[PDB]
Amino acid sequence: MACKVKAELEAAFKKLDANGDGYVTALELQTFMVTLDAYKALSKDKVKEASAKLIKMADKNSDGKISKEEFLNANAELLCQLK
16 A cells, blocks of 8 residues: 655644644744745755744744654755755
């Protein structure tokens, strides 16, 4: 059968906001996307300047965003290996 990947993105998004009441989400990811719509600048020292703040208020142990978020927010960062 085999069933992986799937709408794994649906988790981060539906959690990225879905309703956005008063919890840290992709709401900043948009900034991520606006500051690096495609991680064109990676996280050499720009992603933390904005994330280090957003993570200190929501990411105490990796609870704010965990799923496709790590996928889309870590896929590039985890894959990043340019020359």
